[PDB]
Design a protein around this ligand. Sequence first.
Ligand SMILES: C[C@H](N)P(=O)(O)C[C@@H](CC(=O)O)C(=O)O
Ligand SMILES: [Zn+2]
Ligand SMILES: [Zn+2]
Length: 392
Amino acid sequence: MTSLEKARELLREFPVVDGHNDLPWALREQVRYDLDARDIAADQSAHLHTDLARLRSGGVGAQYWSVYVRSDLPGAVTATLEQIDCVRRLIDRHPGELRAALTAADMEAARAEGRIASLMGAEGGHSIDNSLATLRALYALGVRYMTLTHNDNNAWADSATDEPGVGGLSAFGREVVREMNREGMLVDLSHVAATTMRDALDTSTAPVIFSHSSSRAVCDHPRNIPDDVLERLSANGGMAMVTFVPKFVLQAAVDWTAEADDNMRAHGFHHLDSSPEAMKVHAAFEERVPRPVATVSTVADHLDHMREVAGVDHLGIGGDYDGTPFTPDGLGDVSGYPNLIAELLDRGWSQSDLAKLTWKNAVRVLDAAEDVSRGLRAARGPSNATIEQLDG
Ligand SMILES: C[C@H](N)P(=O)(O)C[C@@H](CC(=O)O)C(=O)O
Ligand SMILES: [Zn+2]
Ligand SMILES: [Zn+2]
């Protein structure tokens, strides 16, 4: 049998727990949650990275559905609740394929049934509107991780893609990490600045995750993780879940995006400007300078290195499917994972390495959060501290 045939057999036993998929956001944006217009029980390949048949072909057995919302629009709490409701509806619509998962035991029960465990992760600390009770409410509704920032600073944590602000976490950001630990909610350090990564590692008495971050040593971009941070993962007990975003994982794509943004600025536009005029300048650039293409090999290079630095017990996969418009060759949509495992097989990764990578690490990590939480819930009550009290 080929390495791809081997990869599929491996995935049948220990399937992918994917750390981050933005299908609910794509459904919000494409069809305002008209679930029938994007039915995942049918082929959605013209519109979406994700449907159920492709998840099957990809060997996915658990998914952290992102409940991402925009930090630059008001009503983030309300939008979050709508994102969470989008997830609940998908689960309710597809009970043969999907099973709601709140615990590492739910993940395993799902695997033994052959259903995809469906968990949730909030994407950015703005979803709590500086309110500890709101954090506790997201937990009560099934949220099992929170990325401390999205693309911009919040009042209490700094983003990797914004200028320095509080300098990592503030006193209230530490308090947030504390309540996350006591609740049992995974601290997600994707998107945050390296200063924040280090403060959260200092504060957290539970394993933390990176739900969709690759390697900064392999490809220098601040969305990636520095080696000094990966080096602390073993003691912390968490895991880094490699992402596929070409403009994070391929040096040529990083350089290209930077040159493209510089060209946008040369024409007097903000790089994120999406006007028709902004779009004309961009197409003219891409006409001159074709976009580089990342491959399965590009992603495997991050994994090789993270494995060397962090260790095989501290890795996972977070594809950012439906969260990003571009993908690596061979990692086109959520059916792609077997191509990555086949590559890793060709590079001498053992079958147990690979089962840790796909399944066992993520289960271990969520279990550990639950454990830490039990201790902290018996030790003290929930915090009633305010951002005003702690941060002034
Ligand atoms: C819209 C998604 N929720 P995102 O902005 O997090 C997308 C990617 C990056 C990108 O595709 O622009 C990221 O994870 O940093
Ligand atoms: Zn993201
Ligand atoms: Zn996302």
